[PDB]
Each structure stands twice: as C-alpha cells, then as structure tokens.
Symmetry: C3
Subunit: 478 residues, 3 copies
C-alpha cells in the first residue's frame, strides 16, 4: 500500500480444485462473507498494480462474471487470461502473460486465487525486497509444523536457495524439510519468459511446474531470492475443506479482535462469527453463539445474542437482540427483540419497539414504542406507535394482493385476533380477544366476533364419567 510501477499481477485460478470435492469452483467458496477470489482481488487492488490478470480454466464462464463485478466494485480493470487445460502452474503463468503486451517491461507478481488471508504489507514487502536485492525471481516461503503437500525450499548451508521440490517429486529426506513454497512470486518479466520456455513435464505429475523456474534461474546464474513470512497464516492456501475452515476460523479471530480493541465486548470469540463488512459500536456486548453476517451494522451499547444470526440487519443504539434469527431488516434504538424471534426481509422496528418470544415479522413496519410480545406473525403490514398487539395473533393476506393491513397508534388488540388483509384499524381502537377482523375498524371503536362464554355445569361427570376429572366430585363435597 501502495505498489510501484509498472507492476503486473497474475492470479492463477485455473486449477480443477478436485480436493474440494465440490461442484462449485474452489475460488468461489466463501469465508467471512467473501469468496476466496473476492478476498484475493480486494487485497491486490489496494496495492494498485498497473495490470491485474486472472487466469481461469474450463469453468471460466462461472467465474469471469464475478471478476467483472469485482472490477467494478474495486473501481478498476481486471482482465482474464484463459487456460483450457490445467497443464501446470508454469503453463498457467504463460497463459496469463499472453494477456500482456508482448513487450511488457514491468515486474510480474504471481499469486494464487486460493489464499484469502494474504495482506497488503506482505505483497508490498515482496516487490520491495525483489527490487532491493535486484532479484530475477523472489519467492515467498514460510515454515509449517506439517509441510505435507507443499513445495520444499532447498537451501545450502549458505541459506542460498537452490530449488523448490514438490511433495510428489520429493525424496523422503527432502520431505522432512518444513520450509515450504508459499506460491507467491515476483519476477523480472524477461527472465520469467526465458525460464518458462524451458520447463519440462517430466514429473511425478507430468505437468509444467512454475516451481522449476527458480532452479533454471539459479543455473542461469541469475539472482534467486527467498523471503520468509513468519505469520504463516497470511500465506496459507485452501486446497480442501479442512483448510477452508481453519482459515475461516483464523480470519474470524482477527476480525473479532479488531472489534474488541475498538471497544466491543465479545464474550466468546470462538463462537462469534463476524463477516468483514459488519460494523459494531462502542460498549456493545455480544454473547456466545452469534453470527453477524453480510452488511449487518450494530450501534453502540447494544446487547446481541446468545444464539443470534443476523444477515444485513441494522441495529440502532441501546437495542437488545437476543436469540433472534433475522435478515435485511432494521431495529431502532432501545428496541427489544427476542428471545426466539424471527425477522424476515423488509422488517422495520421503530425505537423502543418490542418483538417478543415466538414472534415472526416479514415485510412490515412497526412504529415507535409498539409491542408485539407473544406468539404472533406480522406479515406485510404497517403498525403505528405505542400500540400493543395481543398474543397469539396473525396478520396475514391470502394473496398476489399488494394491499397492506394498516394499524394506527395507541391501539390495543386482544389475544387471538386474526387480521385478514387488507384491513385498516384506527387510532386508539381495541379488539376483543378471539376476534376475526375482516372489516375496517374506526378510531375509538371496539371490534369483536367471539361469542359469549357459556357454562355446562356437571358436564365432566355426564360426558367423561370415571375420569381423573371426577375430581369435580372431590371438589363438590369439600
């Protein structure tokens, strides 16, 4: 942050990713609310290289679209190079180069589409070191407890880099090496072209190994330079779903920490999932088993969770959102939502409103200070202020009617009222318990439909004789 020039970045993304066992292209799997690809491109764009090229393989029609979207989001131009068949990483670099002017003179940085955690600094350091050491190729390495599967970096006691050897081609002895190839490079474009031209597919994998390039350039008498990255997580890639979840977990730790340091109490970081676009205000407390997803925004002094999932929800200041499942909705200041509350898209709850337990709202607006405390569904309706919706009620329209039920302010509807849409209820109106409202109700009016209660006096003895409820017999002689 930022890059020099002219710098061109290739992002290899044309591998089959068979180890994911997925019918969804590897780079499109997500963590923290962005696909791996989106993560990679966001970091790269922040460095603003002259050219940004994504090498894609056979399923490129499924991916190029996303790339164009990111191009626009990122305010820049991102090109696509094709590689019909995965003949190797080296071959992929060729294809990606084919999208540069044959006379390109800038540095060529190579990275992968499956390293979500890679950051601006690590890249900027990479090129900087590459220029300082006047290297023909610079390669990022890191050390792993288990180096299995990755390229072993061969050094002489000199610490001089000799070559990179793949897991498949390595000897048992070489496999003990725990310093591995990160797969992030900086090249002198001419040396890169030269070296690539000479690759051979005589491998355990019979492919064209981009990694062979550090060996040919050693042998060319060129400057070959490795650069160790300590924070190995930054350089970690995703080849299967085990590694996906580990990177997800690790990214999540960093996002949660940042929030904690900015004044957010997270009781249980290991159990609080927060996407990268989420914002949270000061002195807010998040309880365990909570996930805040998409573009969710929480104000200050809120209490969220436990066991709460919010996608693209906006929460004002001083609100409580407990054991709630919700998406695309707004909760105003000092509102109380939960526990056991479901908000569907389109829900807007005003300041000091209350959505209680076993309440669901979809596409509804609920005015300041209004309470829907119990066992109620509110669909496609607008409610006013300081009203009180009785328990066990339902606002529903049997459709595709786009007419909305309307309820005024200071209303008090009775337990078990069914509102058949579309209907209009006036300010300070009441409804009787067990009322079916099919007709508008005037301000100050009382709507009712329930019949009068009648008592059948010795009914249990007569029509349920001998039962335990022959405890009426006990009660009588007492």
């Amino acid at each position: 942050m930022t890059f020099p020039g002219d710098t061109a970045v290739l992002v290899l993304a044309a591998g089959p990713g068979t180890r994911m066992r997925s019918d969804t292209p590897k780079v499109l799997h997500t963590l923290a609310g962005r696909s791996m690809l989106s993560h990679v491109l966001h970091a790269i764009a922040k460095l603003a290289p002259q050219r940004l090229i994504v090498v894609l393989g056979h399923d490129h029609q499924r991916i190029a679209p996303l790339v164009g979207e990111l191009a626009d989001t990122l305010g820049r131009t991102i090109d696509v190079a094709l590689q019909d068949r995965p003949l190797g990483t080296g071959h992929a670099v060729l294809c990606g180069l084919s999208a540069l002017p044959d006379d390109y003179a800038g540095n060529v940085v190579v990275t992968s589409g499956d390293t979500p955690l890679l950051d601006a600094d690590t890249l900027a350091d990479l090129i900087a070191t590459h220029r300082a050491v006047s290297a023909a190729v610079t390669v990022l390495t890191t050390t792993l407890d288990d180096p299995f599967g990755y390229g072993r970096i061969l050094r002489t006691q000199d610490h001089e880099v000799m070559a990179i050897v793949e897991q498949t081609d390595a000897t048992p002895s070489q496999r003990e090496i725990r310093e591995v190839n990160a797969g992030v490079y900086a090249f002198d474009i001419a040396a890169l072209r030269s070296a690539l031209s000479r690759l051979s597919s005589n491998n355990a994998q019979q492919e064209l190994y981009l990694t062979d390039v550090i060996a040919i350039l050693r042998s060319d008498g060129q400057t070959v330079h490795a650069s160790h990255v300590d924070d190995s997580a930054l350089v970690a890639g995703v080849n299967n779903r085990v590694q996906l979840a580990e990177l997800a977990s690790e990214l999540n730790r960093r996002v949660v920490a940042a929030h904690q340091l900015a004044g957010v109490t997270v009781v249980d970081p290991a159990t609080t999932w927060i996407d990268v676009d989420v914002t949270i205000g000061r002195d807010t407390v998040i309880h365990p088993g909570t996930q805040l997803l998409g573009r969710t925004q929480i104000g200050g002094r809120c209490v969220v969770g436990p066991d709460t999932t919010l996608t693209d929800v906006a929460v004002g200041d001083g609100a409580s959102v407990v054991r709630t499942h919700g998406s695309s909705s707004s909760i105003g200041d000092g509102a109380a939502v939960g526990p056991f509350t479901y908000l569907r898209p389109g829900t807007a709850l005003g300041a000091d409103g209350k959505l209680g337990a076993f309440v669901e709202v979809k596409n509804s607006t609920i005015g300041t200070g209004t309470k829907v405390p119990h066992l109620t569904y509110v669909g496609d309706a607008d409610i006013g202020e300081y009203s009180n919706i009785g328990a066990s009620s339902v606002f529903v329209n049997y459709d595709t009617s786009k007419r909305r039920t309307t309820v005024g302010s200071h209303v008090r509807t009775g337990s078990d009222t069914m509102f058949v849409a579309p209907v209009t209820i006036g300010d300070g109106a009441y409804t009787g318990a067990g009322t079916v409202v099919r007709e508008d109700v005037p301000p100050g009016a009382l709507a009712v439909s329930a019949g009068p209660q009648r008592n059948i006096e010795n009914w249990v003895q007569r029509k349920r004789p001998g039962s335990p409820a022959a405890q009426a017999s006990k009660r009588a002689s007492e």
Copy 2:
C-alpha cells in the same frame, strides 16, 4: 486389520471407576454416539482375534447385557470373565485368562475398556512388533506433556526397558519421566501366567500390578520390548470426566475432518458435533452450533444449522434444516425446515414441503409441496399435497384414540383453525379464519364457525376513559 492367530484379547473393565463420580459404570459413558465399551469392542472385532474376553467386576449384570448385544452386532462371540473384587490389573488379567482353555497356546493381547480412540493399526502393529522382536511381553507407551497419574516407563540409556513404575509408587525423580505406560500389551501366554503367579501386593495401592510383570520378565532374562505410539490420543484413557470431554472433542475433530475431505463444508468444526454413524452428502453446508446424532443421514447440497440438533433424522437432497430440534423423522428433497422448528418422532415431510417458525410436528405425514409456515402444532395427522395450513393452528386429539385426522390435497386452512381429531378434510377444501373443525369437510367446501365482526363505535372513550387510547379523540378532530 486383520489379526494373526491364535490371538486372544482381554479387555479389562472391572475397575470401580471412582474418579468418574458416577452411578453409571465408567465404560458405559458415551462419546460420538457409542459407549466407550462399544468403541473398544468395535475396533477389536475388526481385527478378528480367535478369542475375545471382557473382564467385568461387581456391576457386571449392568454390562454383560450390552456386551452380548455388541457380540451380535459385531457378528461374533464375546465372552465374559468375572473379577468379584478389584484386587488389581494383574489380578484382572488372571480372571480373564480363567476363561481360556488351561492349555491355550495363542498370544494374549491385553487392553482396557476405557480407551475409545484406539485404532486397528495400533493393535495390528503391536502384535506384529511383538512377533518380529520375538518378545515375551510388548508394551505400548507414549509421551505426554503431563504424565501425571500414569505409569512411568523406566529405560536405561540403552533405551532398554527396565520396569514400569506407577504414579503412586514413583519417586519425585521418576515422576519427571514423561514417557508413560499406555496399558496396552501383547504377551507370550506362558510367560504371562508365570509372571502373574509371582506378583506381590506390597504397593502404595496394595494391589496386584499387571505392570510389575515387565520387571519380573526382565529379571527372568526374557525379551521385554516397548513400542512408542506418537499419536498419544489413540492411547488415551478415560478415568474422569475431564478426559472424557477431551477424547470426545478429539474424536469429533477426526470425524468432522473426514466429512470435510469427502466434500462437506463445516463452517465451525469446534461447534459441530457429529456421531460416528452419521452420513453427509457432497456440497452440504453445516453451520455452527449443530449436532447430528445417532443414525442421522444428510443428502447432498443441504444447508443444516446454525443451532440445529438432529437425532436419527433423514434429510434428502437440497433441503434446508435451520435452528431445528428434531429426532426419528424424515425430511424430503428441497424441503425447508426452521428456524425454531421442532420435529418429534414419526414425522415425515415430503419433497418441497415447508415447516416454518414456531412449528412442532409429531407422528405426522406431510405431503409433497405442503406448507405449515407459522405457529402451529401438527400431531398424529396425515396431510396431502400442495396444501397450506394457516398460522396459529392446532391438530390435536384428546385421547388413547389411534384415529388420525386426514387432510387432502390443495387444501387451504385459515389462520387459527383448531382441528379436533379425528376429522377428515377433502381436496381443495377451505376453512375460515378462527374455525373450530369437529366435523368432516367435503372437497370444495368451506368450513366456518367464527362469528361476524361487529363494531362498537365510541367504546374506548365510554369504557376506558382518559386512557392513552383517548387518541381516538385526537383522531376524530383531525
């Protein structure tokens, strides 16, 4: 996988397990859906020894039954040796031997009933090494950060094994040894009998230590061989509930990983509990706070969780099961269940069906494409296809009547309908909101019981004067 012959396995399980502080025999505590005992016997049977014997103690009537069950499940014969009083591990081995022909000539492998994670390879390697080194006794060891409580393996600089010393009998110096006895052995039966005969109870515990046997056989000039196990977890035992939860956690990690590698996305492995018999199809996504228990089976391309608990539930392909608690039930392809949904035993939901929020179903069948979206209980009933059960409804029978309410296809029942079982509703029937159905309803018919809505016009002012709902007064002059 598999074993040589003749090989006889003793499983010591006759200890009191006092450190569990439980009124339930240690080996019967569970993890990942099997008792420790069931885990142990499953691994052993896979190796198919000639003889399999379980030594049990005083509460053997509570355990022998389970053993016979496992015998049948495992397709083999498992014997029981008794040890009335826990006089020691050595003594337990005697008792277990008493169930072999006095002239038994095979190798005797000894293991414990409290090591759930022990695997086939570790055992097969054990006997193999025992035969190769022509050992009189071979003993599995491993190294622990905290070796507290376990037998210290004493070696000379030779790496030669000299003896095993128990925590209780060890010196402060010996206690620093971090290589410990795993309690898994292979014996030459004759040397074992010989050695056991000579044990003495002159201990800190005043018991007959099976471990003394490696010392007497050293002194006998017999071949004594230790075999180190690196993956210490495999050899970890459960003596208290701290260790139980650690092994549970570790087993769970391995089960989740396997699923991830086979193409299942688990967002949060630390918070996803999956029993050993559960199956999950490709590209399925499991969200945090989910447990899949018993013989639950999930198809492909499903979304399960967050906060979902399924025991013996079957889920087709492309289904969503979110914030659901359920057991012994089936959810067909493309069905949507949750959030906040409860399925009790006997529930069968057809393809493309929907069980919504704050819905409970027990012992009911629900046809293809049928929706029960809100606040409804469906008990002991059968519903047809493409129907729509209105919110806030109840299907209940006041019993022990085994007659089932029946609802046809393309039905649309109105909000707040109570169905008193047993009743039959015909295809394309409707019910009015707030209807109590006690009588059959013919196809194409409309059932209703609710009264007409009536409005009492200035009622709030008259019977609740001065209230905030004197906002009718405001409304009138506006």
Copy 3:
C-alpha cells in the same frame, strides 16, 4: 490462606483504562458473574490482611459504592484512597499509603484491580517468600510468549534482579526479554516510603513508575527479590477487551473442570459457560451452547441444553431443561422444559410438570404434574396439579391489576382458549377449543364460546374459480 500480620494490601484501581474504549470503568467489567474488582477483593479477603485499601481515581463515586457492598458481603472493612489524577503507579501507591497511620509497621502488599485470576496461594507464597528472603521488596514475575506491553525484568547472569523496564522505555534489545513484571509486590513499608519519595517522572510516559522502586532499592543496597509464577494466567491482567475474553475463557475452563471432576458431564467445555456461584449435582449432563449464569443451581441426574441460558434458575433432580431461555425461576424434580421455551422471573414449575415448545411463562406457579405443552403464554397465573393446558392458549391480564387467574387440579383446557384475567377455573373443569373465558368456571363444568361448525358445500368453485383448489372438481369425479 491465611495471611500473617500486620499485613496491609493496596489495590491500585485508579488508572483511566483507556484501552478498553469503554464508558464503563475497567474494573467493573465482568467475567464469570463477577466484576474484575469483585474477583480481586474476594481473593484478598480470603487471606484476611489487617488493612485493605482500594485506590480509586476520578470516577470513584461509580466504584466506591460497589466496594462498600463487597466490604459487607466479605464481612470486613475496606477503605478507599483517592488519586485525583493518574500520575503513575508509584504515585497511586502513595495515595493508598496516605490511608494508613503515618506510623504503620506492617508489610505492604500491592496488587492491581484488573487481575481476576489471582489466587490465595500465589499471594500467601508472595509474602512468605518476602519474609523468608528478608526482602525489602519482592516482585512477582512470569514468562510470556508475547511479553509486549509489560515490564521487562532485568537480571544479571546471577539471576539477580537489577531493575524493571517498561515497554515504553525499553530498548529493542530489552524488549526481547520475555520475563515480565506481574505487578504484584510485597514491601517493607519503610523502604517503600523511602523509595517512592525519590521517584522521577523523566519517562517516556512522564509518570511516576512504581517499577523504578526495585532499581532504587538495588542501588540502596537493599534486598531485592523476584518470584516467578509459572501459571502465568494467575498473574494476567486486563488492559483491553481481547485480554478480558481470554481470561474469561480460561477461568471458565477451570470452573467447568472442577464441576467435571465432581461428577458433572459437560459435553463441550468450550461452549459451556458457568458462573462462579452456580452449583451442579452428580451425573448431570450439560449439552453444548449452554450458559448457566448468576446463582443458578442444578440438582442431580439432570439434562441441560443444548442452547440453554439460565440466570438464577433453580432446577431439581432428574429434570430436563432443553433449548430454554430462563431467569429467576424454579423447575422441580423430573420436570420437562423445552425445547424453545422461555421462562421469565417468578416462574415456579412443580415436580413432573411440562413446559413445551414455544411456551412462555412469567410470574406463574404451575402445580405438580401439570402440562403446558404447546404454543402458549402463561402470565401472572396459578395452576393446580395434573392439569393440561391446551395448545395455542393465552393467560393474560390487561392491567395494573394484581389479581391472578386461578386454575384448579385435573383441569383440561381446550386448544385455543384465551383466559382474560382475573378468572377462576375449578377442579376437573374443561374448556372447549376456541373458547374465550371471561367468567369463572365451576368444578366439573364445561366452558364454551365457539360457534358450531357449518359447511358451505361448493364454495371453492363458486368464490375462487379456476384455482388449484379446483382439485375439488377432480375429487368429485373420482
């Protein structure tokens, strides 16, 4: 446990705690159900020093009250020293000394208000070592992977302590030191006064560093002694919310372990939060995603969770409390609560009672063997024994009426009954489904209000023509 005399303890708590980014004083943030301050004072009081003094800063009116409360709770006297401005830790010690008689002769122990995990032993060892070594000052140290931010303890090869150097004032070389100052001290009061008098504010922070005192006393030719604490967590302090959550997590591990060792099965310790005052009986099983808060007490042989949150709830023996959110309530032996159940303050559920799914109770008593199984709200009411409250019902009073609805024993109320408070229902009474009870109901009586079901026979064809529910047409010709 216990302390010698005369021993005086100063608790520094007058720092601004800016790194918390909180409008709530650092020492008042909580973990495991106690503020850091309450944790600190509880441990100190258990040692019973002659004098206990808390140094507070500008917001002391917000804290001194809590201190007085703890004074009473702890059965002792705790004084407050003021320090108007945070001029440094050394300066804070002065202020705290100002609350001792000018001729005080006892030892002075200094500790911080932000070290929740500090235990009795570590303190008792501190003074004991201080007296043994006849030290003028003894200082607790510990070793950290990341020593960032803490005072580096400078030793000569002698292991002799030379000085403590702060992060801000340390050299890059000194910063590599990973042995750090714990900020827990024991002093000879005279040497302490002497040394403090000579402090200088010529610092990177330009403050009066209590830490300089170990240097002046070295230079005084006094005895200076460091004491290493291995369990670094005991000596860990909270300066930001990252460290808060880590200590919370670590404390929680220790509390859960203790319970496990006393015979409580916790399936998932990392996901089970248990406050310090909670009690749990033998053979109880706690499932993942559970938090037991405040003074919650669980009997024996219970099943609690998953996804259960209890604050100050009392649970008898053999009860199941599953996916329940509850506070200030009681659940009797063998009761079944959940899943998806909400208990508000004042709820008392008798033995063998059942609160089912999507049920909420507030301030209500529910007799032995009574069942409220589905979709019901029970507010401010008293129910008798072996009754059965039908699904989809509501007990609610439209208020501030303190009269309580009353229901007798062996009652069976029908699905969709609304009870308008206050009302009285007699033993063995029944209610019809869809009944609005506004009037008392006599024993053995049947209350009803619902109208008779009527059928409109070809209604779908007539008033919804062409619809899919023209499957009545199909049904007719079949």
